Amino acid sequence: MKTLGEFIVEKQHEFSHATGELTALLSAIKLGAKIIHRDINKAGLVDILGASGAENVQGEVQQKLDLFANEKLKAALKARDIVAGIASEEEDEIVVFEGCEHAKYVVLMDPLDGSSNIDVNVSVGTIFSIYRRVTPVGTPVTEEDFLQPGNKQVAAGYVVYGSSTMLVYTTGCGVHAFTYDPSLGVFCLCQERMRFPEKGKTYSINEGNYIKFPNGVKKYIKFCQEEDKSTNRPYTSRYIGSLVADFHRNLLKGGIYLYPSTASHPDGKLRLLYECNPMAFLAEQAGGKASDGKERILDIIPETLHQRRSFFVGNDHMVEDVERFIREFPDA
Amino acid sequence: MKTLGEFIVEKQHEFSHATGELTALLSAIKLGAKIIHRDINKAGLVDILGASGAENVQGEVQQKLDLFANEKLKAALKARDIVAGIASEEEDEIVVFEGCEHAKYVVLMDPLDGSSNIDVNVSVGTIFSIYRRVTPVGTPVTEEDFLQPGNKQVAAGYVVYGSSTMLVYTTGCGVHAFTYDPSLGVFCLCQERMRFPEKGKTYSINEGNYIKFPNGVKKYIKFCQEEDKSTNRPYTSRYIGSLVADFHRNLLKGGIYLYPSTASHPDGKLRLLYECNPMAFLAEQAGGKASDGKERILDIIPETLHQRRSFFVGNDHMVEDVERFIREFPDA
Amino acid sequence: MKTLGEFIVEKQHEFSHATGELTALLSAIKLGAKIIHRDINKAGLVDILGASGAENVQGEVQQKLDLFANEKLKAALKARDIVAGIASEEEDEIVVFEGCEHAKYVVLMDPLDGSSNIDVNVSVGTIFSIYRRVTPVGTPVTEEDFLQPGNKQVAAGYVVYGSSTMLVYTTGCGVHAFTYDPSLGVFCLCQERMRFPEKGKTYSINEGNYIKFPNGVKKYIKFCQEEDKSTNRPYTSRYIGSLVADFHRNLLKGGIYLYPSTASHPDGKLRLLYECNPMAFLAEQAGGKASDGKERILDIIPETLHQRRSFFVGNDHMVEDVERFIREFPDA
Amino acid sequence: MKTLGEFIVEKQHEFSHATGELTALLSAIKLGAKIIHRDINKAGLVDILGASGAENVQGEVQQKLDLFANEKLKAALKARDIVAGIASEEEDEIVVFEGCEHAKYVVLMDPLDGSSNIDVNVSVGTIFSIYRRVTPVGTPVTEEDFLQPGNKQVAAGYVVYGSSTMLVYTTGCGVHAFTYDPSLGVFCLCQERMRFPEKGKTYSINEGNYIKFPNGVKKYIKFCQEEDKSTNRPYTSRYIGSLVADFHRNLLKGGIYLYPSTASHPDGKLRLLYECNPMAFLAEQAGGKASDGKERILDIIPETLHQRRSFFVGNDHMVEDVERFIREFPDA
Ligand SMILES: O=P(O)(O)OC[C@H]1O[C@@](CO)(OP(=O)(O)O)[C@@H](O)[C@@H]1O
Ligand SMILES: O=P(O)(O)OC[C@H]1O[C@@](CO)(OP(=O)(O)O)[C@@H](O)[C@@H]1O
Ligand SMILES: O=P(O)(O)OC[C@H]1O[C@@](CO)(OP(=O)(O)O)[C@@H](O)[C@@H]1O
Ligand SMILES: O=P(O)(O)OC[C@H]1O[C@@](CO)(OP(=O)(O)O)[C@@H](O)[C@@H]1O
Ligand SMILES: [Mg+2]
Ligand SMILES: [Mg+2]
Ligand SMILES: [Mg+2]
Ligand SMILES: [Mg+2]
């Protein structure tokens, strides 16, 4: 058995050499993960289900856990005295940590991914993206430190709260998965080099929004449903409704997750900086691919803190098929 | 706070008056649920993921947890000295408990529902159906005690192993949900009278098998995707891949679960006695509806222990729509 | 592995044949045990340490946990609808359960034994004594049902909250020990027939009260300290300060627990009905002995609900030595 | 709420300024503490009770947990890549960690204190002492780095596995206590500046070894038993049999722990380096006193790795009384 902490110590060569800082960063993450896990694991008996009475900066009806997760992760990150500030999907502005002007890291987060699944005992998660600041240390970080392109991330990962609670991350040298052991109260390594299998046979998308999908996506969907054993078609459909959850399964069994533009979300629903970039960094480290249907997610220059974007991620051949259909059937 | 055990004591009028027997029956269930929960909650750290090397009587590639769950629930039921025998989706024949010829109850079970989700940290469950034997007490039960129609069940329910572990059941007087509290090691009441909301806006089906669905189901699907605010359309799509899990969400938020006949499963994939009947008894007690697309699931006279059947379950208006389309578009 | 519940089902011949009632009784016990264990296991982080601001009917400064334990066990017993009423070391009068006039059992309890050890993370426990009522069923129990001699107990046992939480009990056919498994949330059998070893080498007493002990006890103490290998002397001294805890160790390794009359407690400190009788029933079922220094604890006719009594319990030869010294050195 | 990790970050001024190193050191400690806690918390259900079949370098019959604890803590310390080597009460020689010649810290430990209490569900503990090496970094530590006087410790503390699991330590700026929360899987601060109360009224000693105690100790004992309200006498007696446990209680309620020379242990039973020094450093930081009956424990120049020593520790006035009686009654 090897804990997450010991693994971080072990892999000194990773993280651009800062072992002690990576430890503090992930220590804050798992602390927050543990705190959140506790409430979720007893959701029905704990008063955490339902709307908090506030509306997201995303223009969404916030749930109580969303806020709880937000505050806990935020306090956990501020207490390690290692981050200068954070950006969160539940916050309107960036949060500058007072007294941390000295810190050289910033963290972008999606505190509780899969809000719709909280009340129904279905998998939810947490997503984090870590960047090295660009502004002068000793000064308060600015949006400039939060609008860097995905290819500049020094770390990214997620926590999935499912039948078991796992923490998955990368620093640019493969994707490592750790499982929380309630018997010990520690995260243990369960898979050091996660990689998408050779071929994927599952597509994850909200087919209820069919009519409003780009014509290329509609065609790809039809493609998935055609019969062709030579290529494992028709594919199996799986859509949990939680990004972290569907991503995790697809990484283990192979598959693709799709969230294109719809009527309600002209530019896709997911957010570039809190959801797309971190998951793209992960998908790529696993030998997969992630694009907005045309260009590489990690190379997109962010325009606004809460910018949204179409997202297609998973096995390379599958994502490549999507890109080809959009190419052959551009939506007029 | 009120535990499952205290609730059973409290609701004396339910279960056709046998409080002490209902307690023993569910005591075996939660014991098995707890044992299974333990392994699943640490799946990655425990050697339980993967094929066991055997093939189901369903002609399926059995997973290790499937067997584990089977043996544990079976031993738990035999140890309460309250059941004469069991039938299981993982067993070829009925299991007659030696020394229990005196018992007057039989239990049909789906030890581990959602086998495909075990290795990917996604929700799985357990389904149980309880019948009062028809054969003379003191004698070994026969298939006759296991082939009774669904309307004869004296109890049914399920265990869902998701972000939290819950036990949901009914004895004919509403559906009660209990959440397991790891802090206490007990199941606590969290919802006494679960009922489907007035309207449902979600459909759960494996759309990858589209081309092979009955034409009426294909039409219903298209219907779900049309735009019509007056009727909350298009609906949201959600398909976890675990029957228990999708059912649970639909019962709480409203929706319909569909598993019609396909090329691989001419008579639907789900099994009448271990999956359809218990979930139909539950759906009905919640004010919902469950049919095979034409007739009431609970009134079907079972022909074989492992008989399969098309299954449409959830909000009544939604299930009624499915039945209407199959009616208007009979598949030639 | 075999749980407490399954063991009770198994040993049908015990408990004067009432399996279903013994199950309900102990089910209430472990529920209360679990609830108490939860707070104690996190005592430092939970606001439960310190005086509650009330004085025991024992004329003692009550601690918060004492009351918590009292209320929880009381509510747990009332909710099983199996007990007509209870008597407790923390209550002035007997508690008659409204609506349970039909119940035929009464329970006497010491909700939290070892009050002085609660704040210092040291072992504490719970003691229960179960009697069959003597008053007409259908009527409210009276003190008469609570003042029966110890030899009339149909059951007795204790819960020890130490490095691990165990439940030890007897119904007149040996002493059975069960350990709580936090991983499963169930009590598992760990020792079916506990018996004192052949010889004991440990004495448990509060030697700080030496000068005020009966002269016979002072002599026994000196005896324990003499050197004599032929008889394993001098003995080892062990006094945890918690009756349940010192008893448990002595039952496993052999030894004697002593609490004679002192200046502050002319008739010993322990209470006959809530502490002495149950532990005496247990000690005897393990092949041990329990007396007030002269006569058999279990045969004493109780005079008052809160009567106190000298208590010497453990290996028979050791208790016999105490009785001999008191005999040879009667305190004038 | 504040975790142990966050507290360490917070108190930068302590530990002679090495926050990142103190974190790694205690991280290894709690990991080991957690691992040990897991087995102990289920001792009866886990095969860990009983002799391992080997004899300590102490000439004692080793128990299975003793060895388990030893190996786990040892592996946990080696995996942090922060310690050059360790000395343990269960090891004959010092353990030099290969590949850690670069580390500048050494740890002396008593992996499992209170071996006699393991099988009887009574409190046990773990003791650690941390020193900064004296030998040239880059070279393998030698006994010289392990035979430094107690006053050179840069850190010390213990883990007590009782009704709850706590971690208590000091780096020279007061004694801090943390409680493990099984609900979260983290150690939380529960008391930042533990101090002995003004006066103590409890003495902890194995009075079974009376006849062989130094005459001064025999007199002190008699003193404790005299009646004198003006000075809270006679004192209460408490002796759990576990050093860590009796120490903890005495620190919270006030008292003294005594283990003088006996027939079997001419130089006391406790070991200077693994038991006396760390507990003396702790007692002193709490405003208490610790001596061998004549001189200050922390100033004694260690002669051998496994040197034993008389130990009197707790409230200053009580320890001072012991020293006075030994002075007035030197044992001829
Ligand atoms: O309800 P739809 O439109 O399918 O959106 C589902 C997607 O939205 C997200 C957004 O984070 O969930 P949610 O809005 O419920 O938080 C993703 O986790 C998920 O993949
Ligand atoms: O893979 P598909 O064909 O969608 O089948 C999913 C359905 O099959 C079942 C059968 O029990 O899961 P599984 O076969 O993986 O055990 C249901 O739980 C689930 O709803
Ligand atoms: O403090 P002293 O007088 O030794 O009393 C200890 C005895 O008293 C009892 C009484 O129950 O503890 P406590 O009063 O602290 O509750 C026994 O558990 C214990 O054996
Ligand atoms: O059995 P006695 O001689 O009282 O020794 C008890 C003392 O010895 C120690 C030594 O560590 O316990 P143990 O030998 O059982 O490990 C101390 O923890 C305890 O205070
Ligand atoms: Mg999200
Ligand atoms: Mg199934
Ligand atoms: Mg008591
Ligand atoms: Mg020790």
PDB file of N, CA and C in Angstrom, chain C residues 40-42 45 116 119-122 162-164 181-183 188 206-208 211 222 225 234-241 248-249 252-253, chain D residues 40-42 45 116 119-122 162-164 181-183 188 203 206-208 211 222 225 234-241 248-249 252-253:
ATOM      1  N   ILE C  40     -18.555   9.463  22.090  1.00  0.00           N
ATOM      2  CA  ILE C  40     -17.326   9.178  22.830  1.00  0.00           C
ATOM      3  C   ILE C  40     -16.098   9.083  21.928  1.00  0.00           C
ATOM      4  N   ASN C  41     -16.268   8.459  20.766  1.00  0.00           N
ATOM      5  CA  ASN C  41     -15.178   8.269  19.819  1.00  0.00           C
ATOM      6  C   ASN C  41     -14.628   9.592  19.293  1.00  0.00           C
ATOM      7  N   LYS C  42     -15.381  10.670  19.497  1.00  0.00           N
ATOM      8  CA  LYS C  42     -14.970  12.000  19.058  1.00  0.00           C
ATOM      9  C   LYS C  42     -15.175  12.994  20.198  1.00  0.00           C
ATOM     10  N   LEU C  45     -13.822  16.562  20.083  1.00  0.00           N
ATOM     11  CA  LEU C  45     -14.381  17.424  19.051  1.00  0.00           C
ATOM     12  C   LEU C  45     -15.872  17.675  19.248  1.00  0.00           C
ATOM     13  N   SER C 116     -15.814   9.347  35.697  1.00  0.00           N
ATOM     14  CA  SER C 116     -14.543  10.051  35.891  1.00  0.00           C
ATOM     15  C   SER C 116     -13.571   9.898  34.717  1.00  0.00           C
ATOM     16  N   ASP C 119     -13.740  12.475  30.245  1.00  0.00           N
ATOM     17  CA  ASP C 119     -12.918  13.581  29.751  1.00  0.00           C
ATOM     18  C   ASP C 119     -11.454  13.232  29.494  1.00  0.00           C
ATOM     19  N   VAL C 120     -10.974  12.123  30.047  1.00  0.00           N
ATOM     20  CA  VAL C 120      -9.573  11.759  29.865  1.00  0.00           C
ATOM     21  C   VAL C 120      -9.281  10.635  28.874  1.00  0.00           C
ATOM     22  N   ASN C 121     -10.200  10.416  27.934  1.00  0.00           N
ATOM     23  CA  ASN C 121     -10.050   9.397  26.890  1.00  0.00           C
ATOM     24  C   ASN C 121      -9.822   7.971  27.400  1.00  0.00           C
ATOM     25  N   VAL C 122     -10.265   7.702  28.621  1.00  0.00           N
ATOM     26  CA  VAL C 122     -10.115   6.379  29.206  1.00  0.00           C
ATOM     27  C   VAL C 122     -11.422   5.594  29.085  1.00  0.00           C
ATOM     28  N   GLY C 162     -13.780   1.007  24.740  1.00  0.00           N
ATOM     29  CA  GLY C 162     -12.343   1.173  24.910  1.00  0.00           C
ATOM     30  C   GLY C 162     -11.648   1.366  23.573  1.00  0.00           C
ATOM     31  N   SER C 163     -10.464   0.779  23.405  1.00  0.00           N
ATOM     32  CA  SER C 163      -9.748   0.896  22.136  1.00  0.00           C
ATOM     33  C   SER C 163     -10.669   0.397  21.028  1.00  0.00           C
ATOM     34  N   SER C 164     -11.597  -0.475  21.401  1.00  0.00           N
ATOM     35  CA  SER C 164     -12.596  -0.991  20.477  1.00  0.00           C
ATOM     36  C   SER C 164     -13.861  -1.086  21.323  1.00  0.00           C
ATOM     37  N   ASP C 181     -17.641  -3.718  14.591  1.00  0.00           N
ATOM     38  CA  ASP C 181     -16.750  -3.519  13.448  1.00  0.00           C
ATOM     39  C   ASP C 181     -17.182  -2.248  12.721  1.00  0.00           C
ATOM     40  N   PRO C 182     -16.460  -1.135  12.926  1.00  0.00           N
ATOM     41  CA  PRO C 182     -16.790   0.141  12.281  1.00  0.00           C
ATOM     42  C   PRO C 182     -16.808   0.044  10.761  1.00  0.00           C
ATOM     43  N   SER C 183     -16.070  -0.922  10.210  1.00  0.00           N
ATOM     44  CA  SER C 183     -16.017  -1.122   8.757  1.00  0.00           C
ATOM     45  C   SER C 183     -17.345  -1.652   8.233  1.00  0.00           C
ATOM     46  N   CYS C 188     -19.780  -8.316  15.879  1.00  0.00           N
ATOM     47  CA  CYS C 188     -19.412  -9.666  15.483  1.00  0.00           C
ATOM     48  C   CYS C 188     -18.954 -10.478  16.677  1.00  0.00           C
ATOM     49  N   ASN C 206      -9.118   0.812  44.603  1.00  0.00           N
ATOM     50  CA  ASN C 206      -8.622   2.181  44.734  1.00  0.00           C
ATOM     51  C   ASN C 206      -7.854   2.242  46.056  1.00  0.00           C
ATOM     52  N   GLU C 207      -6.573   1.898  46.012  1.00  0.00           N
ATOM     53  CA  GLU C 207      -5.755   1.886  47.214  1.00  0.00           C
ATOM     54  C   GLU C 207      -5.581   3.234  47.903  1.00  0.00           C
ATOM     55  N   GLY C 208      -6.084   4.294  47.281  1.00  0.00           N
ATOM     56  CA  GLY C 208      -5.987   5.605  47.896  1.00  0.00           C
ATOM     57  C   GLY C 208      -6.884   5.653  49.125  1.00  0.00           C
ATOM     58  N   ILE C 211      -6.642   3.492  54.342  1.00  0.00           N
ATOM     59  CA  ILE C 211      -6.947   3.684  55.760  1.00  0.00           C
ATOM     60  C   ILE C 211      -8.398   3.451  56.171  1.00  0.00           C
ATOM     61  N   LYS C 222      -2.437  -6.458  51.877  1.00  0.00           N
ATOM     62  CA  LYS C 222      -1.073  -6.776  52.304  1.00  0.00           C
ATOM     63  C   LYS C 222      -0.703  -8.151  51.762  1.00  0.00           C
ATOM     64  N   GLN C 225       0.460  -8.211  48.326  1.00  0.00           N
ATOM     65  CA  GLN C 225       1.789  -7.625  48.177  1.00  0.00           C
ATOM     66  C   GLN C 225       2.941  -8.445  48.742  1.00  0.00           C
ATOM     67  N   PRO C 234       4.061 -11.315  44.811  1.00  0.00           N
ATOM     68  CA  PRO C 234       2.962 -10.344  44.824  1.00  0.00           C
ATOM     69  C   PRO C 234       2.227 -10.189  43.488  1.00  0.00           C
ATOM     70  N   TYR C 235       0.937  -9.881  43.572  1.00  0.00           N
ATOM     71  CA  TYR C 235       0.107  -9.690  42.388  1.00  0.00           C
ATOM     72  C   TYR C 235       0.396  -8.364  41.698  1.00  0.00           C
ATOM     73  N   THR C 236      -0.085  -8.240  40.468  1.00  0.00           N
ATOM     74  CA  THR C 236       0.077  -7.007  39.720  1.00  0.00           C
ATOM     75  C   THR C 236      -1.142  -6.169  40.065  1.00  0.00           C
ATOM     76  N   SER C 237      -0.955  -4.858  40.132  1.00  0.00           N
ATOM     77  CA  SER C 237      -2.053  -3.958  40.444  1.00  0.00           C
ATOM     78  C   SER C 237      -2.546  -3.273  39.168  1.00  0.00           C
ATOM     79  N   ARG C 238      -3.865  -3.220  39.005  1.00  0.00           N
ATOM     80  CA  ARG C 238      -4.474  -2.569  37.849  1.00  0.00           C
ATOM     81  C   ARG C 238      -5.815  -1.998  38.282  1.00  0.00           C
ATOM     82  N   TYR C 239      -5.989  -0.698  38.075  1.00  0.00           N
ATOM     83  CA  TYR C 239      -7.229  -0.041  38.442  1.00  0.00           C
ATOM     84  C   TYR C 239      -7.452   1.111  37.467  1.00  0.00           C
ATOM     85  N   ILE C 240      -8.287   0.844  36.467  1.00  0.00           N
ATOM     86  CA  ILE C 240      -8.623   1.804  35.423  1.00  0.00           C
ATOM     87  C   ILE C 240      -9.577   2.898  35.919  1.00  0.00           C
ATOM     88  N   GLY C 241     -10.397   2.576  36.917  1.00  0.00           N
ATOM     89  CA  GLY C 241     -11.324   3.569  37.443  1.00  0.00           C
ATOM     90  C   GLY C 241     -12.700   3.421  36.823  1.00  0.00           C
ATOM     91  N   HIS C 248     -13.803  -6.420  32.674  1.00  0.00           N
ATOM     92  CA  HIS C 248     -13.463  -7.033  31.391  1.00  0.00           C
ATOM     93  C   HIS C 248     -12.048  -7.601  31.381  1.00  0.00           C
ATOM     94  N   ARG C 249     -11.068  -6.789  31.764  1.00  0.00           N
ATOM     95  CA  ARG C 249      -9.679  -7.258  31.790  1.00  0.00           C
ATOM     96  C   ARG C 249      -9.521  -8.466  32.717  1.00  0.00           C
ATOM     97  N   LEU C 252     -10.731 -11.706  31.290  1.00  0.00           N
ATOM     98  CA  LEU C 252      -9.848 -12.227  30.254  1.00  0.00           C
ATOM     99  C   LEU C 252      -8.494 -12.721  30.748  1.00  0.00           C
ATOM    100  N   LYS C 253      -7.889 -11.986  31.677  1.00  0.00           N
ATOM    101  CA  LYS C 253      -6.575 -12.343  32.209  1.00  0.00           C
ATOM    102  C   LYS C 253      -6.633 -12.934  33.609  1.00  0.00           C
TER     103      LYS C 253
ATOM    104  N   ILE D  40      -6.247  -2.051  16.014  1.00  0.00           N
ATOM    105  CA  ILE D  40      -6.658  -2.024  17.417  1.00  0.00           C
ATOM    106  C   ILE D  40      -8.164  -1.841  17.591  1.00  0.00           C
ATOM    107  N   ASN D  41      -8.752  -0.978  16.767  1.00  0.00           N
ATOM    108  CA  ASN D  41     -10.176  -0.683  16.837  1.00  0.00           C
ATOM    109  C   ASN D  41     -11.038  -1.908  16.544  1.00  0.00           C
ATOM    110  N   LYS D  42     -10.425  -2.942  15.974  1.00  0.00           N
ATOM    111  CA  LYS D  42     -11.127  -4.180  15.650  1.00  0.00           C
ATOM    112  C   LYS D  42     -10.302  -5.369  16.135  1.00  0.00           C
ATOM    113  N   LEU D  45     -11.673  -8.932  16.203  1.00  0.00           N
ATOM    114  CA  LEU D  45     -12.001  -9.515  14.910  1.00  0.00           C
ATOM    115  C   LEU D  45     -10.773  -9.682  14.020  1.00  0.00           C
ATOM    116  N   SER D 116       0.656  -4.971  27.698  1.00  0.00           N
ATOM    117  CA  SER D 116      -0.224  -5.798  28.528  1.00  0.00           C
ATOM    118  C   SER D 116      -1.712  -5.483  28.349  1.00  0.00           C
ATOM    119  N   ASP D 119      -4.730  -7.056  24.465  1.00  0.00           N
ATOM    120  CA  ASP D 119      -5.757  -8.098  24.419  1.00  0.00           C
ATOM    121  C   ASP D 119      -6.996  -7.819  25.267  1.00  0.00           C
ATOM    122  N   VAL D 120      -6.905  -6.891  26.213  1.00  0.00           N
ATOM    123  CA  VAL D 120      -8.045  -6.608  27.078  1.00  0.00           C
ATOM    124  C   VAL D 120      -8.827  -5.330  26.784  1.00  0.00           C
ATOM    125  N   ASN D 121      -8.739  -4.849  25.545  1.00  0.00           N
ATOM    126  CA  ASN D 121      -9.457  -3.652  25.098  1.00  0.00           C
ATOM    127  C   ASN D 121      -9.180  -2.385  25.912  1.00  0.00           C
ATOM    128  N   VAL D 122      -8.024  -2.340  26.561  1.00  0.00           N
ATOM    129  CA  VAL D 122      -7.648  -1.183  27.358  1.00  0.00           C
ATOM    130  C   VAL D 122      -6.686  -0.289  26.573  1.00  0.00           C
ATOM    131  N   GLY D 162      -7.414   5.269  22.824  1.00  0.00           N
ATOM    132  CA  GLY D 162      -8.392   4.959  23.858  1.00  0.00           C
ATOM    133  C   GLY D 162      -9.807   4.993  23.306  1.00  0.00           C
ATOM    134  N   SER D 163     -10.758   5.506  24.085  1.00  0.00           N
ATOM    135  CA  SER D 163     -12.139   5.598  23.612  1.00  0.00           C
ATOM    136  C   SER D 163     -12.138   6.387  22.307  1.00  0.00           C
ATOM    137  N   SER D 164     -11.128   7.233  22.148  1.00  0.00           N
ATOM    138  CA  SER D 164     -10.947   8.007  20.928  1.00  0.00           C
ATOM    139  C   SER D 164      -9.435   8.024  20.729  1.00  0.00           C
ATOM    140  N   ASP D 181     -10.822  12.282  13.912  1.00  0.00           N
ATOM    141  CA  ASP D 181     -12.257  12.254  13.628  1.00  0.00           C
ATOM    142  C   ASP D 181     -12.512  11.200  12.554  1.00  0.00           C
ATOM    143  N   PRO D 182     -13.005  10.015  12.947  1.00  0.00           N
ATOM    144  CA  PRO D 182     -13.283   8.930  11.999  1.00  0.00           C
ATOM    145  C   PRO D 182     -14.262   9.341  10.906  1.00  0.00           C
ATOM    146  N   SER D 183     -15.100  10.338  11.192  1.00  0.00           N
ATOM    147  CA  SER D 183     -16.080  10.830  10.216  1.00  0.00           C
ATOM    148  C   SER D 183     -15.387  11.560   9.072  1.00  0.00           C
ATOM    149  N   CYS D 188      -8.009  16.668  14.390  1.00  0.00           N
ATOM    150  CA  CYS D 188      -8.439  18.038  14.625  1.00  0.00           C
ATOM    151  C   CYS D 188      -7.933  18.547  15.958  1.00  0.00           C
ATOM    152  N   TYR D 203      -2.388   9.550  42.173  1.00  0.00           N
ATOM    153  CA  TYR D 203      -1.076   8.958  42.011  1.00  0.00           C
ATOM    154  C   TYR D 203      -1.267   7.662  41.223  1.00  0.00           C
ATOM    155  N   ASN D 206       2.169   0.980  40.319  1.00  0.00           N
ATOM    156  CA  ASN D 206       1.776  -0.421  40.457  1.00  0.00           C
ATOM    157  C   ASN D 206       2.065  -0.815  41.906  1.00  0.00           C
ATOM    158  N   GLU D 207       1.103  -0.572  42.789  1.00  0.00           N
ATOM    159  CA  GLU D 207       1.282  -0.873  44.200  1.00  0.00           C
ATOM    160  C   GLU D 207       1.498  -2.344  44.534  1.00  0.00           C
ATOM    161  N   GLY D 208       1.383  -3.209  43.533  1.00  0.00           N
ATOM    162  CA  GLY D 208       1.610  -4.622  43.771  1.00  0.00           C
ATOM    163  C   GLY D 208       3.087  -4.853  44.062  1.00  0.00           C
ATOM    164  N   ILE D 211       6.506  -3.845  48.447  1.00  0.00           N
ATOM    165  CA  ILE D 211       7.653  -4.301  49.235  1.00  0.00           C
ATOM    166  C   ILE D 211       9.028  -4.045  48.626  1.00  0.00           C
ATOM    167  N   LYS D 222       2.520   6.036  51.486  1.00  0.00           N
ATOM    168  CA  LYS D 222       1.804   6.151  52.758  1.00  0.00           C
ATOM    169  C   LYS D 222       1.279   7.574  52.893  1.00  0.00           C
ATOM    170  N   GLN D 225      -1.847   8.253  51.182  1.00  0.00           N
ATOM    171  CA  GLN D 225      -2.987   7.606  51.827  1.00  0.00           C
ATOM    172  C   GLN D 225      -3.414   8.199  53.163  1.00  0.00           C
ATOM    173  N   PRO D 234      -6.611  11.723  51.646  1.00  0.00           N
ATOM    174  CA  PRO D 234      -5.856  10.860  50.732  1.00  0.00           C
ATOM    175  C   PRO D 234      -6.196  11.043  49.249  1.00  0.00           C
ATOM    176  N   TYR D 235      -5.199  10.827  48.397  1.00  0.00           N
ATOM    177  CA  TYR D 235      -5.370  10.952  46.954  1.00  0.00           C
ATOM    178  C   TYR D 235      -6.145   9.778  46.370  1.00  0.00           C
ATOM    179  N   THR D 236      -6.603   9.950  45.137  1.00  0.00           N
ATOM    180  CA  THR D 236      -7.314   8.890  44.446  1.00  0.00           C
ATOM    181  C   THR D 236      -6.240   8.097  43.722  1.00  0.00           C
ATOM    182  N   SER D 237      -6.439   6.790  43.622  1.00  0.00           N
ATOM    183  CA  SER D 237      -5.483   5.935  42.939  1.00  0.00           C
ATOM    184  C   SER D 237      -6.006   5.569  41.549  1.00  0.00           C
ATOM    185  N   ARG D 238      -5.129   5.656  40.553  1.00  0.00           N
ATOM    186  CA  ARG D 238      -5.484   5.308  39.180  1.00  0.00           C
ATOM    187  C   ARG D 238      -4.240   4.768  38.493  1.00  0.00           C
ATOM    188  N   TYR D 239      -4.348   3.557  37.960  1.00  0.00           N
ATOM    189  CA  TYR D 239      -3.230   2.938  37.274  1.00  0.00           C
ATOM    190  C   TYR D 239      -3.795   2.034  36.184  1.00  0.00           C
ATOM    191  N   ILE D 240      -3.806   2.567  34.965  1.00  0.00           N
ATOM    192  CA  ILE D 240      -4.316   1.874  33.789  1.00  0.00           C
ATOM    193  C   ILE D 240      -3.361   0.779  33.295  1.00  0.00           C
ATOM    194  N   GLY D 241      -2.065   0.951  33.545  1.00  0.00           N
ATOM    195  CA  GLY D 241      -1.103  -0.052  33.111  1.00  0.00           C
ATOM    196  C   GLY D 241      -0.468   0.329  31.788  1.00  0.00           C
ATOM    197  N   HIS D 248      -1.593  10.872  30.094  1.00  0.00           N
ATOM    198  CA  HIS D 248      -2.644  11.708  29.515  1.00  0.00           C
ATOM    199  C   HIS D 248      -3.666  12.152  30.556  1.00  0.00           C
ATOM    200  N   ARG D 249      -4.212  11.204  31.309  1.00  0.00           N
ATOM    201  CA  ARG D 249      -5.199  11.546  32.338  1.00  0.00           C
ATOM    202  C   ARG D 249      -4.612  12.519  33.364  1.00  0.00           C
ATOM    203  N   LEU D 252      -4.388  16.070  32.205  1.00  0.00           N
ATOM    204  CA  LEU D 252      -5.690  16.723  32.143  1.00  0.00           C
ATOM    205  C   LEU D 252      -6.341  16.995  33.494  1.00  0.00           C
ATOM    206  N   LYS D 253      -6.241  16.039  34.412  1.00  0.00           N
ATOM    207  CA  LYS D 253      -6.847  16.173  35.735  1.00  0.00           C
ATOM    208  C   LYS D 253      -5.837  16.464  36.834  1.00  0.00           C
TER     209      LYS D 253
END
